[PDB]
């Protein structure tokens, strides 16, 4: 009993250390966009003279967004959308091109890197009002609708979006721009699934020299990362995982691991539900690892 | 009796490996907590550097006043309650003419007009500002061995993020031990200033104390040792915060932490004071910092586990 416990407790600690590393990685975009939101809300917060604390034009705000992309290579992008006439009169900017404005002048910049890496901007006019469901079960405008409805930060499950002519699966990290209790807009950043897959492959290598495999499962059950096969990213976990596993995914409470042994295959399954800063999201790190890679010392002792 | 030697060594190994795993988990949580202030102030730097970066037309990408930059700093304090403060210093005449501001009080300016705001919370929790005029140019060694202006001198010298070992500063009439998280404000390859935020040692101590209560049910202790060997945290004794780890450790321990590779664990077993010590050095992002987590476990607690392990094995 006690020996198996001490071995199991090592396994869980090492897995917990990797959850913490993934959390650090996934909390970073939210902290970045929190900063932009805490600066941009000052456009609508009066100071001692009764005028906004920050008197930045739209071009200066976009400069902040562009600087974010330039100086955070791990972020796929940075984007901001204001409510209609949130901080100025949309109609005065309608028809101005190349600045991220909707046709009616709404402020909707999406900044990302062109082919040569230099930041470019697109208006989000097409997606910001779209409530259509993307192929991964995510509402097209969820990155904006979620902060608007909840007035809190939102991390969005994997969804495909077209970026410079290619389809990129990504997850968004979003914070509302609040002036008092008024939702004025939202600012966010995406991480690509390719980036997060690379993170999870690194994490899995730290567990018994990569003897096992890991999966990162979003709140809707779809795969953010899956070290076994890059082709499964964005798929329902139920379409990759064996019945034993997709069952245990429903047996989970945040921060409490679930530990199981698949008898037919002789491996350990470890499920570590976790959350990310103030986003309220519940993702799950799953570890699948052969018993032999973990319990060799027990085996050695029983050999004596 | 060889078998007994082989069996005991193997039982000890499983215990030793578990504690190493717990130390790695604790280091990973510490890294998560300590990366956060650097990301915040990187955002401040990435906005403020726009005051000197040219746009398409030549004029600067951000035309914001000192008041507006201070509003960004105040907003950071207000909205980041884990942070003790937020502060920024510009080179002389970095983004404007200091002399136009010389003499103006209550805005965080030096006597000569240099921009040097230090924003923190008053007793009512609302942010207030102090100029860093007395510290920004002082290389005096503070009681913890840190230069008074290291928070600025290190980003200036190295042009990269800097995390500073514990140092005391007067805030609101009281001496507070803190560690700063600093980044340079670069326009191109030119240092124009730096921006930073402090965490109090009280905050880090509290973190480590809460974690120690989950290690052998609080029976042991933890410490965090800064790059110069002084205590960032020490769960046993609040009064050692800032003190040399060598002052509270009876072995050769702190000396050959210098010789230990980042992310390599090292046990030091002292049967004489009944202590098992585990050191795990680590770094934080690209700061270059070298801090060490220490776990201290009563030997008798591990001795007791070995007995139960040995017995359970003998029973079956
Ligand atoms: C990709 N958008 C920027 C359009 C939304 C966030 O994923
Ligand atoms: C919306 N207002 C700017 C009027 C309130 C600020 O708190
Ligand atoms: C306390 N200061 C802000 C003066 C320096 C950073 O520790």
Residue numbers in the entry:
A (entry chain A): 25 to 328
B (entry chain B): 17 to 332
List sentences from the manuscript:
We demonstrate that this chemoattraction is mediated by the PctD (PA4633) chemoreceptor. Acetylcholine and choline bound with high affinity, with dissociation constants of 23 and 2.6 μM, respectively. Crystals formed in the presence of acetylcholine and choline, and atomic structures were determined and refined to a resolution of 1.8 and 2.0 Å, respectively. The structures showed the typical dCache fold, and alignments with all structures present in the protein data bank showed that it is most similar to the LBD of the TlpQ chemoreceptor from P. aeruginosa in complex with histamine, another neurotransmitter. Well-defined electron density was observed for choline and acetylcholine, which permitted the precise placement of ligand structures. As in the majority of dCache domains, the ligand was bound to the membrane-distal module. The quaternary amine moiety of both ligands is coordinated by hydrophobic interactions with a number of aromatic amino acids (Phe124, Phe188, Tyr206, and Trp155) and two methionine residues (Met169 and Met215). However, the tails of the two ligands point in opposing directions. The choline tail interacts with Ser217 and Asp235, whereas the acetylcholine tail interacts with Ala168, Asp171, and Ser172.
